[PDB]
């Protein structure tokens, strides 16, 4: 169900795997928020990718068909001047 809790996994560039408690109705915004709680990274620096596809803040995990035990990839935005 849309409000039922599940785990997803976030892989970082540092080799680390975050475990998150999410609901399919959570937005990508929400997920990024949870990643700040756990990893101290501000949401606006985070780039979440599923299998090569970048994930939009306003859409939900349900929208993307991301289901329990799924693996996301996290990278930070680059800083070139």
């Amino acid at each position: 169900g849309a409000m039922d809790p599940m785990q997803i996994f976030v892989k970082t560039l540092t080799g680390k795997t975050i475990t998150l408690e999410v609901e399919p109705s959570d937005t990508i915004e929400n997920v990024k928020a949870k990643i700040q709680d756990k990893e101290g990274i501000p949401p606006d620096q985070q780039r979440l990718i599923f299998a090569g596809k970048q994930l939009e803040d306003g859409r939900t995990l349900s929208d993307y068909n991301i289901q329990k035990e799924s693996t996301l990839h996290l990278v930070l935005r680059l800083r070139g001047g």
């Binding site: 996994f9 892989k11 560039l13 795997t17 606006d44 780039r47 990718i49 299998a51 090569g52 596809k53 970048q54 068909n65 035990e69 693996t71 990839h73 990278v75 935005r77 680059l78 800083r79 070139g80 001047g81």
Partner: protein, 309 residues
Amino acid sequence: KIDVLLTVDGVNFKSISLTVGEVFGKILGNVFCDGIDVTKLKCSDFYADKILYQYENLSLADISAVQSSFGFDQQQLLAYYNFLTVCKWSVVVNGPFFSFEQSHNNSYVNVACLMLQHINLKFNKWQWQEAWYEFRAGRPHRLVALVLAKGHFKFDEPSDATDFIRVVLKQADLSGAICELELICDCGIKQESRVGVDAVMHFGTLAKTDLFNGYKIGCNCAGRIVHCTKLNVPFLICSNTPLSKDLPDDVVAANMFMGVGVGHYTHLKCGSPYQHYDACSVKKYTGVSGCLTDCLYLKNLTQTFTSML
């Protein structure tokens, strides 16, 4: 008496007449004409039948209107006009391409725009399509201000070129661009039909061949293979964390990032000599300058491949 059109959105106009020599700002407030802040200028013949943009202190209706035609809320609109004022970077021509002088941490804009110059684009919004045509004619100032505002970029801050490209492609009509994918895991199997920006932009590898041949990404099970079974796109950008200096096959242009945190973007085109771009300067190619982050492909991007089942 000079006749002008007043607007906030570029769609709904009001006709007003002005008296020659009146200062625009004293009559109308903060106003722009053809991208230029004309608030302090005087009303001339020159402005006859031209369009003047107001932008401050908008009603709910006006905000909604500019949300349609620009994609902006009130804050993005203020940033847009501020960027037009503050981002007057010198544009330098080199053959068929233009680039920017190094200024206010703009290398990510420089390389994103150098890449954009290889592709054709149609835009959903008139405002953006007009800015694009200006960009095509060697006048990128208006497009740059739209993108920076739209994307919430901060002025004079090192930023990310994939993001700049991405803001542009999200405003484009890419409705025919398809890419069909199969994700092979031991935990489960998934198929995806990506459309639009999801089809023309791929993250996780620089190499188009990796999508065709299939390539492994980290999962929680034994391994996840990402594999393209059908591709039909006008162009393709493959992006990744700056990790490798090895240029894949068939690349047309590419961005490179050098630094150990904060860093600097350069550009390369794969022409008959091969050109390397650093700000407004061009040079013979002598290898990668940092690591590849974005890689543009153009040719033969209509393909079907065998499924892996």
